[PDB]
Amino acid sequence: VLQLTIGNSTITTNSVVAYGRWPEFIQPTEPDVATCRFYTLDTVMWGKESKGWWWKLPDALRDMGLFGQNMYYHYLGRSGYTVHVQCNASKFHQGALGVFAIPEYCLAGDSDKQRYTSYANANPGEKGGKFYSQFNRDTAVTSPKREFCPVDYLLGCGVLLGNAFVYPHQIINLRTNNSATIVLPYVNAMAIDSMVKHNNWGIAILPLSPLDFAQESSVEIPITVTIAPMCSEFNGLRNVTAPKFQ
Amino acid sequence: VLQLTIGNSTITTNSVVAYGRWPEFIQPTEPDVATCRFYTLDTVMWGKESKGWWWKLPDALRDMGLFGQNMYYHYLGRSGYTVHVQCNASKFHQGALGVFAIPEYCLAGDSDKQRYTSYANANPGEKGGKFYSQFNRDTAVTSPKREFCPVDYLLGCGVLLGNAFVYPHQIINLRTNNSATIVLPYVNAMAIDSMVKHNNWGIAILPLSPLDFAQESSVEIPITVTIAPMCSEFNGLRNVTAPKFQ
Amino acid sequence: VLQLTIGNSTITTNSVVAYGRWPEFIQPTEPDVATCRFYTLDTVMWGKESKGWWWKLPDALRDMGLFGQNMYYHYLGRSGYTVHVQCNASKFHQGALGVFAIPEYCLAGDSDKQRYTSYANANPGEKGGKFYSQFNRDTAVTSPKREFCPVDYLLGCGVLLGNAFVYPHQIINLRTNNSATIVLPYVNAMAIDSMVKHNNWGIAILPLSPLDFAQESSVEIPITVTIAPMCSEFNGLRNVTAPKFQ
Amino acid sequence: QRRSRSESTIESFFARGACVAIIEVDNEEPTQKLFAMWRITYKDTVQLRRKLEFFTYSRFDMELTFVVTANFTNTNNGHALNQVYQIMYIPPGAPTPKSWDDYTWQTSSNPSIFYTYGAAPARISVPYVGLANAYSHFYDGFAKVPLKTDANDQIGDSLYSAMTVDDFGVLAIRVVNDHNPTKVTSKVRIYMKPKHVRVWCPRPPRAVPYYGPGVDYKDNLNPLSEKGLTTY
Amino acid sequence: FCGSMMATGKILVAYAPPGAQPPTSRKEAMLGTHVIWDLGLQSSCTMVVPWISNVTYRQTTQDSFTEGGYISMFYQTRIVVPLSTPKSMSMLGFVSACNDFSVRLLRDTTHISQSA
Ligand SMILES: CCCCCCCCCCCCC/C=C/[C@H](O)[C@H](N)CO
């Protein structure tokens, strides 16, 4: 059994390295301990009719630990991630979770106006978001929601979810593995970029096969996403950034 | 002219090292950039009838920059300090500021109950406190203030202010120097101690000679205390500490 | 204290060399003594509402010493300059004089006709000229003044006075220095050119900060411009040139 | 194994020049089509876009080829001498022309082509002019961040997946010839051939028709066609 | 500083990289890069803004993605002037490029114009 320990956080179990590149550094400010903890996101229930979940990195780790504090205080920071998606399932639970790590995971909005989604709805953080079977158009012209309308089979970006495996992916197949680990290096056009506005990665937990258990009516098991910022180094220390999330 | 630069903060002018020891380290978490900034405390006016000011370190640097965040998130942290007390005065301004760095600067309370001062009043932070000519006893038995009653000539600790020069001291004599710098190493019975509860140092800016200017009725000049955490390393990362300051 | 002596003229005080080039020679006629004297121009009062002064070199040194005589008798002469602008100010006088040395200091005329300014008004000499807050247009159509209309913030040449520091400049800041020295080499498209018609340089003394003293109503201090022709060599000795200055 | 991957290389995959824009430029009388400024981008056409959206980041030395095709409009018997077309670059910041007879057409520092109609299409190479170390086909962020201290929401309101408003400036095409009574309507087709292409972080291609310059989509969300499960 | 030689004070010159609230207060300005300038000791202070940027090159236009930052000045200690001294003094600011400074993508300036 694999037991990976980083900083002051240990996770017991296969792990895959995104694009075969390990997170490594490039005077940046690198907390070797305060930012290497495996911050645990909000656990999400995998309902029988669930369509999927999506988080934005490092947006997900904006309020957890000192990583978010260094991210808001500093101007521009680069950080690799280690995403451990653990789904406790019994021998009689069937299902598969595609854990995709989309670089620059641009999602589609609900309104007819292109790229009209707001910053608050595009950066939900630890909460994340969820996919939808169809594309429900925003009809509130007086007060547009300005939120994503991610579609499962379209991956929220118009591409096919079947081809989404071009990204760094890992399949949590409850019959063979109850957890998955993806080590994402800092992927960006720039050597280092502002994290408060830019989301380096996007994690998508999509049920490739529906969850069933003993022919039960409704079955829901927990899914815990634990993200660890690896080699997170920031630069441009200045006054704290307090974004408007409404 | 001396121009000392640390991290991303530069101060232009003599500097004295406390106890002849320079701040040095002893897996602690040491932000080499995020915690080395010269955080500027609230400027205080040196009135003609002023009696003095006192700040507690690292209590003063609890809400400034990521130093306070690392101090609250981590259990126990050690940090040297560099206190630059700058008092802009003209050639015709006369006065002297004793800048004393008391290790374990225990102050006296106002109530008859010994050691009854509360944590909120004993840790004012960037605001700091002020000395008083006499010892005003707390008379509110229904709601005791539970605040210090620091006396100038007693240094708030029963000792004589004249002997306060046993501590690491620097005299800002407006005729010869308009600023003072004291480099305090981490002084504590322990190699590293909780900073949220313990104040490693206490800075006391006491007017040894009253401020006068051109025989004016009331004269007040600014005093700016800029403290830089040097070699600040913390350990015991855990949930943020949110003390009650009322 | 710097005390620079040339020929038979000594000046006691920093000096800056224009374009990093020192005045040096290229059968020219070079008076090693008669033309190296620090000829003192007319002292100008720096009023509180003063806008600036401008002189043309070698036009300024046309009637002082044998330099002007060699300049008028000879056809074409090249000469470096050393301009010492000395402004006696007390410790309580505040102000700044930008001393700019514009190569080919073309000024703007007042009339609507472009380049219509006359030779007499364009070459005032030791008297020099002064800048004006705004651009007053010449309205005398019967008898046009044909004089420059130099504007302070436009430097009399349409450029911004703030960028005028691209030229060899020196700031007389009365708090740190009461004098400035600029050593200008012979700057011209030609190795040597007629001085009676061409002005190799232009000195501009512009108050970058207004002059104030003890909150007085009107304050005016002297400014003395002492120009020394260095390595002045002439050629083409012939009958004296007597320009018409009206 | 033994078959080479020459045609499959990224340099070969983008070796084709793709129409990225069609600019209509007229020489009509002052009655707005005298000149035309097209914001330089491949997202006006979907083919080269989709080829580029195959990857997240790109770094290529572009090669633009302008094919100008002119016609006589509103005249059955029309005459006009061979026209010269000015294709001027206006990078982000350079002053844009407000009219045909504008000073900015002097091109003192803006690079410009003067293509004589009937000659070979005007080709020019452009290096990687990206600010970052690679072109960002996809951006999962914004340009501004709405802060708590902002006076209004429009201060930090920015378009999603939009880095800069003036991405890479505008291409201003005009007819250098004077306005003739005979109106000659011209179409300048710009063909983009990425050269020295280096791509990073591949992405699946868009299976639904594009909708705007982002990853949004409105209709035609049915890429797959009906087919039996056991039908070969 | 263009004040009197008898005028002293401390000016905090702060560069705050973008991505946060502009430094409307000295407490926010001292969190970013900053330098204390004593008006009495030195009449001119050089605040070097290091090249910190996400992109390798910022744009010359005003755009929020390649925005440079925020330069501010505050009174660390107020100006102290004796009697018979001008209480209100002026100062100048000079911007310059360092040796590492460079530009690319030559273009036409928006400043100059020609009516036609
Ligand atoms: C006649 C002179 C014309 C000069 C043409 C050179 C203009 C250079 C602009 C080429 C840039 C286009 C390639 C970049 C595409 C971007 O990545 C996408 N718009 C999205 O980021």
Coordinates of N, CA and C in Angstrom, one line a residue, chain C residues 9-70:
Chain C
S9 N 41.0 82.6 -14.1 CA 39.7 82.7 -13.4 C 39.6 81.4 -12.5
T10 N 39.2 81.7 -11.3 CA 39.0 80.6 -10.3 C 37.6 80.7 -9.7
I11 N 37.0 79.5 -9.6 CA 35.6 79.5 -9.1 C 35.6 78.4 -7.9
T12 N 35.1 78.8 -6.8 CA 35.0 77.9 -5.6 C 33.6 77.4 -5.5
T13 N 33.4 76.2 -5.2 CA 32.1 75.6 -5.0 C 31.5 76.0 -3.7
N14 N 27.5 69.3 -7.9 CA 28.7 68.9 -8.4 C 28.8 69.1 -9.9
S15 N 30.0 69.2 -10.4 CA 30.2 69.5 -11.9 C 29.9 68.2 -12.7
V16 N 29.2 68.4 -13.8 CA 28.9 67.3 -14.7 C 29.4 67.6 -16.1
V17 N 29.9 66.6 -16.8 CA 30.4 66.7 -18.1 C 29.3 66.3 -19.1
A18 N 29.0 67.2 -20.0 CA 27.9 67.0 -21.0 C 28.3 65.8 -21.9
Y19 N 27.4 64.9 -22.0 CA 27.5 63.7 -22.9 C 28.8 62.9 -22.6
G20 N 29.4 63.1 -21.4 CA 30.6 62.4 -21.1 C 31.8 62.7 -21.9
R21 N 31.7 63.8 -22.7 CA 32.8 64.2 -23.6 C 33.4 65.5 -23.1
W22 N 34.7 65.6 -22.9 CA 35.3 66.8 -22.5 C 35.7 67.7 -23.7
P23 N 35.6 69.0 -23.6 CA 36.0 69.8 -24.7 C 37.4 69.6 -25.1
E24 N 37.7 69.3 -26.3 CA 39.0 69.1 -26.9 C 39.0 69.6 -28.3
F25 N 40.3 69.8 -28.7 CA 40.5 70.4 -30.1 C 40.2 69.3 -31.1
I26 N 40.3 69.7 -32.4 CA 40.1 68.8 -33.5 C 41.2 67.8 -33.5
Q27 N 45.0 76.0 -40.0 CA 45.6 76.1 -38.7 C 44.7 77.0 -37.8
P28 N 43.9 76.4 -36.9 CA 43.1 77.2 -36.1 C 43.9 78.2 -35.1
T29 N 43.3 79.2 -34.7 CA 43.8 80.2 -33.8 C 43.2 80.0 -32.4
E30 N 44.0 79.5 -31.5 CA 43.5 79.1 -30.1 C 44.2 80.0 -29.1
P31 N 43.6 81.0 -28.6 CA 44.1 81.8 -27.4 C 44.0 81.0 -26.1
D32 N 45.2 80.5 -25.7 CA 45.2 79.6 -24.5 C 44.9 80.4 -23.2
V33 N 45.0 81.7 -23.2 CA 44.8 82.5 -22.0 C 43.6 83.5 -22.2
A34 N 43.6 84.2 -23.4 CA 42.7 85.3 -23.6 C 41.3 84.8 -23.7
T35 N 41.0 83.5 -24.0 CA 39.7 83.0 -24.2 C 39.3 82.0 -23.2
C36 N 40.1 81.7 -22.2 CA 39.8 80.7 -21.2 C 39.2 81.3 -19.9
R37 N 39.1 82.6 -19.8 CA 38.6 83.3 -18.7 C 37.1 83.0 -18.5
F38 N 36.7 82.9 -17.2 CA 35.3 82.7 -16.8 C 34.6 84.0 -16.9
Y39 N 34.0 84.3 -18.1 CA 33.3 85.5 -18.3 C 32.0 85.5 -17.6
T40 N 31.7 86.4 -16.7 CA 30.5 86.5 -15.9 C 29.4 87.2 -16.6
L41 N 28.3 86.5 -16.9 CA 27.1 87.2 -17.5 C 26.4 88.1 -16.5
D42 N 25.4 88.8 -17.0 CA 24.6 89.7 -16.2 C 23.8 88.8 -15.2
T43 N 24.0 89.2 -13.9 CA 23.2 88.5 -12.8 C 21.7 88.7 -13.0
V44 N 21.0 87.7 -12.8 CA 19.5 87.7 -13.0 C 18.8 87.4 -11.6
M45 N 17.8 88.1 -11.3 CA 17.1 87.9 -10.0 C 16.1 86.8 -10.2
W46 N 16.0 85.9 -9.3 CA 15.1 84.8 -9.3 C 13.9 85.1 -8.5
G47 N 13.0 85.9 -9.2 CA 11.8 86.3 -8.5 C 10.9 85.1 -8.1
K48 N 10.0 85.4 -7.2 CA 9.0 84.3 -6.8 C 8.2 83.9 -7.9
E49 N 7.8 84.8 -8.8 CA 7.0 84.4 -10.0 C 7.8 84.3 -11.2
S50 N 9.1 84.1 -11.1 CA 10.0 84.0 -12.3 C 9.7 82.7 -13.0
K51 N 9.8 82.7 -14.3 CA 9.5 81.5 -15.1 C 10.8 80.9 -15.7
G52 N 11.9 81.6 -15.8 CA 13.1 81.0 -16.3 C 13.9 82.0 -17.2
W53 N 15.1 81.6 -17.5 CA 16.0 82.4 -18.3 C 16.7 81.5 -19.3
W54 N 17.1 82.1 -20.5 CA 17.8 81.3 -21.5 C 18.8 82.2 -22.2
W55 N 20.0 81.6 -22.4 CA 21.1 82.3 -23.1 C 21.6 81.3 -24.2
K56 N 22.1 81.9 -25.2 CA 22.7 81.2 -26.4 C 24.2 81.3 -26.3
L57 N 24.8 80.2 -26.5 CA 26.3 80.1 -26.6 C 26.7 79.7 -28.0
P58 N 27.8 80.4 -28.5 CA 28.6 81.4 -27.8 C 28.0 82.8 -27.9
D59 N 26.8 83.0 -28.3 CA 26.2 84.3 -28.4 C 26.3 85.1 -27.1
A60 N 26.2 84.4 -26.0 CA 26.3 85.1 -24.7 C 27.7 85.7 -24.6
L61 N 28.7 85.1 -25.0 CA 30.1 85.6 -24.9 C 30.5 86.2 -26.2
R62 N 29.8 87.3 -26.6 CA 30.1 88.0 -27.8 C 30.7 89.4 -27.5
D63 N 30.5 89.9 -26.3 CA 31.0 91.2 -26.0 C 31.9 91.2 -24.8
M64 N 32.2 90.0 -24.3 CA 33.0 89.9 -23.1 C 34.4 89.3 -23.4
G65 N 35.5 90.1 -23.1 CA 36.8 89.7 -23.3 C 37.2 89.6 -24.8
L66 N 38.3 89.0 -25.0 CA 38.8 88.8 -26.4 C 38.2 87.6 -27.1
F67 N 37.4 86.8 -26.3 CA 36.7 85.7 -27.0 C 35.7 86.3 -28.0
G68 N 34.9 87.3 -27.7 CA 34.0 87.9 -28.7 C 34.8 88.5 -29.8
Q69 N 35.9 89.1 -29.6 CA 36.7 89.7 -30.6 C 37.2 88.6 -31.6
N70 N 37.8 87.5 -31.1 CA 38.2 86.4 -31.9 C 37.0 85.8 -32.7

